[PDB]
């Protein structure tokens, strides 16, 4: 029928758009994962050095 | 009409798919929230210890 | 045709719903960006002070 066909054009087309919204909304999640994951690696290295020196201190006494 | 019906099959079906893309794109946001929120709790505890010891140091003089 | 019209009601309507799922799934990403970005600025300031004092220590010897 013209229904069946319209109806299954919606089916196909919607299914491809769930898929699209997901792919893209994940992609922006991963933009800002990559953006705070960076500010962390930089805190971890600044803190690494802090543990280094304070191992050096404990050891002088 | 056959329009009205097709048209409102699209209505129903699309509305359920906005809903789906959201639910899932939130769910992946929460996968990677849970994944960096962890690396933080581990920096906070490593830093907690650093504050502990440096309270101990200040106090020795 | 009634197809063409139904078909292009789906077209319009779906396109507006990709757009919606995105806008909203980005908006929740930005809710929880803003929420861990905060816990970081608070670790950076707690750590700033730690670098301050340990510059003071190195300098006393």
Question: Ramachandran region of residue A45, left (φ > 0), alpha (ψ -120 to 50) or beta?
Answer: alpha
| Chain B residue with the nearest C-alpha to that of A42 | B43
Domain region containing A59? 1-61
| Cα B44 to Cα C12: distance, rounded to the nearest angstrom | 49
Helix A43-60 to helix B43-60 angle, to the nearest 10 degrees? 30
Number of domains in chain A: 1
End-to-end CA distance of chain C: 89
C residues 18-57 closer than 8 Å to B (CB): 20-21, 24-25, 28-29, 32, 36, 39-40, 43, 46-47, 50, 53-54, 57
Deposited resolution, Å: 2.5
Candidates A5, A6, A24: best to mutate against B (most CBs of B within 10 A) is A6
Instruction: Please provide the DSSP assignment of C10-61 as one string.
Output: HHHHHHHHHHHHHHHHHHHHHHHHHHHHHHHHTHHHHHHHHHHHHHHHHHH-
> What is the Cα A12 distance to its own chain's centre?
29
| Cα C61 to Cα C44: distance, rounded to the nearest angstrom | 26
CATH of the domain at B19: 1.20.5.2280
Is residue C7 a contact partner of residue A6, using CB atoms and an 8 Å limit? yes
Q: Which residues neighbour C54 within 8 Å (Cβ) at sequence distance 6 or greater?
A: A50, A53, A54, B54
**Can you read off the two tokens belonging to residue C17?**
């719903």
Burial class (CB in 10 A: 0-12, 13-18, 19+), B20: middle
Angle at C35 between CA A43 and CA B18, to 5 degrees: 130
Is residue B21 a contact partner of residue A18, using CB atoms and an 8 Å limit? yes
Residue with tokens 């970005």: C37
């Amino acid at each position: 029928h013209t229904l069946k066909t319209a109806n299954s054009y919606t089916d196909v087309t919607v299914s491809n758009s769930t898929k699209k919204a997901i792919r893209e909304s994940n992609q922006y999640t991963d933009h800002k994962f990559h953006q705070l994951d960076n500010r962390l690696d930089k805190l971890d290295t600044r803190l690494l050095k802090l543990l280094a020196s304070s191992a050096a201190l404990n050891s002088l006494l």
